[PDB]
């Protein structure tokens, strides 16, 4: 009512947007705005003074440098990288052969949060995350378990050591903010895939050095260990080669669960071809036995790419049904690809 028509005359019309430097128990707050300016602000209104804390943005009324209201504005560089969303149409039911592998991780990710009643009454509580890996180049097949996880709660994916070591640091602080922002969005899932920090050869741009790289990773462990945060921000690690990472990383996490990705057998590969070709239309003469017999140590995306190139070649004839001669001639292209060099 009258207060809205009162306090507005004090702040307006012009006002500046500064930053909070430090607070004094005398209700005088020291503000800093562009460029390099200080002051004593004491206001009893709209505060919220305890939730502000130094290091946040505050308004400045021209007369005289008073803060009428609080502003939390994001935006921010890091907040942009977490969303959105995906909520992908794919599910954990579109993959097969890892049922024995997936059972434990699916359980472990749905162990907390959803289905809490048997979890909370048992008093186990293993909230250190999970650790993934496999050969030869998989780990995306383990990401095919992250899509099902993207269907539940909140998800964030941070991959590759380039985002830290491309320039000088400041080291982990880029990760340190990911922890806290995920705490503000808790519960959320943070997935990290292919950690090359110790496996990289040449750093990006001009930065050093091999041992500083290690120290930012070690501070990542203490962040992850950790002292002292109980929040999740559930963390999942994944890579191709676990031997590169130091055993110093395993005790803090993941001490309870780590999975290994086995190579698929004949029955699994048959399932894989089934799931991809479900949407595709194939000729009657295409058989699933000879295909998986001729292939040796191939993942889902390989049998995927051969079908993609079969349909691409079938587009030259503008045919939606891929014949077995076209399928085999297309298969020979990726077969010659891996066998050329």
């Amino acid at each position: 009512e009258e207060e809205r028509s009162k306090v507005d005359d004090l702040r307006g019309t012009p006002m500046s947007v500064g930053t909070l430097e430090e607070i004094i128990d005398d209700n005088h707050a020291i503000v800093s705005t562009s460029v390099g300016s200080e002051h004593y602000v004491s206001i009893l209104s709209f505060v919220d003074k305890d939730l502000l804390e130094p290091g946040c943005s505050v308004l400045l009324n021209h007369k005289v440098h008073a803060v009428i209201g609080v502003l939390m504005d994001d935006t921010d560089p890091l907040v942009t990288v977490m969303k959105v969303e995906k909520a992908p149409q794919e599910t954990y039911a579109d993959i097969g052969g890892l049922d024995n592998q997936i059972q434990e991780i699916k359980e472990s990710v749905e162990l907390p949060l959803t289905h809490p009643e048997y979890y909370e009454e048992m008093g186990i509580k293993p909230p250190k995350g999970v650790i993934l890996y496999g050969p030869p180049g998989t780990g995306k097949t383990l990401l095919a378990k992250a899509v099902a996880n993207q269907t539940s709660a909140t998800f964030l994916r941070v991959v590759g050591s380039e985002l830290i070591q491309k320039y000088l640091g400041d080291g982990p602080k880029l990760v340190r903010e990911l922890f806290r922002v995920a705490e503000e969005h808790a519960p959320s899932i943070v997935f990290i895939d292919e950690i090359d920090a110790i496996g990289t050869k040449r750093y990006d741009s001009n930065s050093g050095g091999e041992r500083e790289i290690q120290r930012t990773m070690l501070e990542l462990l203490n962040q992850l260990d950790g002292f002292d945060s109980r929040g999740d921000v559930k963390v999942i690690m994944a890579t191709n080669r676990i031997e590169t990472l130091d055993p110093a990383l395993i005790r803090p996490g993941r001490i309870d669960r780590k999975i290994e990705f086995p190579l698929p057998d004949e029955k699994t590969k048959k399932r894989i071809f089934q799931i991809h070709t479900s949407r595709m239309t194939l000729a009657d003469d295409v058989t699933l036995d000879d295909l998986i017999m001729a292939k040796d140590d191939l993942s889902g995306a390989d049998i995927k790419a051969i079908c993609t190139e079969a349909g691409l070649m079938a587009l030259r004839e503008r045919r939606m049904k891929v014949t077995n001669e076209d399928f085999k001639k297309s298969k020979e292209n990726v077969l010659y690809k891996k066998q050329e060099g």
Binding site: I30, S37, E38, I124, E219, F227, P247
Partner: protein, 361 residues
């Protein structure tokens, strides 16, 4: 809305109080004293002003390098400001509230005792050591196997008697644009001296303790500044520093910090780590969780996993009820989980046995 109603209704008295002190801009550092009435002062505005002070402030209270308020019109000194340094790095350095009480110990006795008397007893009974002094020691050093790194400090958090202490993370000392760590390490010391006996703890000193010299090129120069400025500011004579010390890392390396500590530090202890008869103690703490059958023997299971510290046997108690949920069992029978416990120790030792003993060896 009612609290915001009364919150916005105090601006009528606030605007009357808004006339004074709102011209106090800005904060300015003094330079020299030519005489008693007149002082030269510098401000961030880049204009250095020589000016007098207000008659409400005693001139004997202003010492060189004290920041004070100013009435821009007359430029005279208004009110001094105690706080000076630093931006948000300090507030991030500060920690509060307890957790992880003493009941969370895994059976270590002589360890926890000998480190209790270095820190907690001097501040618990100060008159005792001053009477019978001699003098309490400066501080300690922690390291060894991972179980249990860094949790022992949480014990001091919950056992802290009155004044909270500050914990510090190691890797934040070293930063891009060399010369930021110099200000960094210095300011927290002055803060501590105002904090009257508050504790400062650096984790993973091995990151900033890289020793010593290499051919070329530095390299360790920006590292050596951090450590050596640390030790130099640690070897100052005033006070110094009453705030005691606390240190922890992983490996005993490197030699330079290790050769500098025994002069200024003492009481280096090594883990220990679960003794045979002590391994069961971790099982006694974790026994309060879930439900322990009266026929379960902890001493039998404990010998089957040497060198596992407390983490791995925590995952033992964890995988008990974990695999019990999948089998719908409410309580974990001793014979049920051990079949998965030999598997959970061996299968995780297959790729790596976790040789922390080899990390420093």
């Amino acid at each position: 809305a009612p609290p915001a109603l009364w919150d916005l209704a105090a601006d009528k008295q606030t605007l009357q109080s808004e006339q004074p002190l709102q011209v106090a801009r800005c904060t300015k550092i003094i330079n020299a004293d030519s005489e008693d009435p007149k002082y030269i002062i510098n401000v961030k505005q880049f204009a250095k002003f020589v000016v007098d002070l207000s008659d409400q402030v005693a001139p004997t209270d202003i010492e060189e390098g004290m920041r004070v308020g100013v009435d821009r019109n007359k430029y005279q000194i208004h009110i001094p400001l105690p706080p000076k340094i630093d931006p948000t790095v300090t507030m991030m350095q500060v920690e509060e509230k307890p957790d992880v009480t003493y009941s969370d110990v895994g059976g270590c006795k002589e360890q926890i005792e000998k480190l209790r008397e270095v820190v907690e007893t001097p501040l618990l009974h100060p008159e005792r050591f001053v009477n019978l002094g001699i003098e309490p020691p400066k501080g300690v050093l922690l390291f060894g196997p991972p179980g249990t790194g860094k949790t022992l400090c949480a014990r001091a958090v919950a056992n802290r008697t009155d004044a909270c202490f500050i914990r510090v993370i190691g890797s934040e000392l070293v930063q891009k644009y060399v010369g930021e760590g110099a200000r960094m390490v210095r300011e927290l010391f002055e803060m501590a001296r105002t904090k009257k006996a508050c504790l400062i703890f650096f984790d993973e000193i091995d990151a900033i303790g890289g020793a010593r010299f290499d051919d070329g090129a530095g390299g360790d120069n920006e590292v050596q500044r951090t450590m050596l400025e640390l030790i130099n500011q640690l070897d100052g004579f005033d006070p110094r520093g009453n705030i005691k010390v606390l240190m922890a890392t992983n490996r005993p390396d490197t030699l330079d910090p290790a050769l500098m500590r025994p002069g200024r530090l003492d009481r280096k202890i090594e883990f220990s780590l679960p003794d045979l008869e002590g391994r069961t103690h971790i099982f006694k703490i974790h026994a309060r969780s879930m439900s322990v059958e009266r026929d379960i023997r902890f001493e039998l299971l404990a010998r089957l996993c040497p060198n596992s510290t407390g983490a791995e046997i925590r995952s033992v108690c964890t995988e008990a009820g974990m695999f019990a949920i999948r089998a719908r069992r409410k309580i974990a029978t001793e014979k049920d989980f051990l079949e998965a416990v030999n598997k959970v120790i061996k299968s995780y030792a297959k790729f790596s046995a976790t040789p922390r003993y080899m990390t420093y060896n």
